[PDB]
């Protein structure tokens, strides 16, 4: 009632694209416990890395690392099908516990990060500093990462749909679709949002008949 313990910077994890995903927002009163469900980036993926971040920057590399841990024992499945629940728990003593539970396999991996960990009062105000200074550049980096993920989705999603189709797809359409996927997969390698959107345009137009088949 005269003071509060609060988190001075956001706390979350690295997700696909090297983006920070926030679990506990800046200026939250401790104690506190928040959960979110994540999944696997690629097929038959046996493990995830849980990289813990403190900071307000969107690029994971621009935030302070507090540690990372693996959870393995993820049973083979399509990507985005496994449920990896991540929980950030800060108790009254200012300790952050982070868990990852595979909701199928019941398995679990924690890390404990002392109250003393992370950036000091000075480094904090610097971080808030750069966040506002590089809001623009961070917005750009985000909507490129979103584009890259939309592309990747569209790419993997189409390839699967091409196999389930088999003989059902006209040779012509397969030739044209496979060319666009090869060029998208190339574009995804690079940093040029416009060019990824261009290969995503090229696919939509040539894939019209493949889509129909997926019925």
């Amino acid at each position: 009632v005269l003071l509060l313990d609060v988190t001075p910077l956001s706390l979350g994890i690295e997700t696909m694209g090297g983006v920070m995903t926030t679990l506990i927002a800046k200026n939250t009163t401790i104690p506190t416990k928040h959960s979110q469900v994540f999944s696997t980036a690629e097929d038959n993926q046996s493990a995830v890395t849980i990289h813990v971040l403190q900071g307000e920057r969107k690029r994971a590399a621009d935030n302070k690392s507090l540690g990372q841990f693996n959870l393995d024992g993820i049973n083979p499945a399509p990507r985005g099908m496994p449920q990896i629940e991540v929980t950030f728990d800060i108790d009254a003593d200012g300790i952050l516990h982070v868990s990852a539970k595979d909701k199928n396999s019941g398995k679990e991996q924690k890390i404990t990060i002392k109250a003393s960990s992370g950036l000091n009062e000075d480094e904090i105000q610097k971080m808030v500093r750069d966040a506002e200074a590089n809001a623009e550049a961070d917005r750009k980096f985000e909507e490129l990462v979103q584009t890259r993920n939309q592309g990747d989705h569209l790419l993997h999603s189409t390839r699967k749909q091409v196999e389930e189709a088999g003989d059902k797809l006209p040779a012509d359409d397969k030739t044209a679709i496979e060319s666009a996927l090869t060029a998208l997969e190339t574009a995804l390698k690079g940093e040029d949002k416009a060019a990824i959107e261009a290969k995503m345009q090229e696919l939509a137009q040539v894939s019209q008949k493949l889509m129909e088949i997926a019925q």
Partner: peptide, 5 residues
């Protein structure tokens, strides 16, 4: 390895 929503 890597992780997504």
């Amino acid at each position: 390895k890597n992780i997504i929503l």
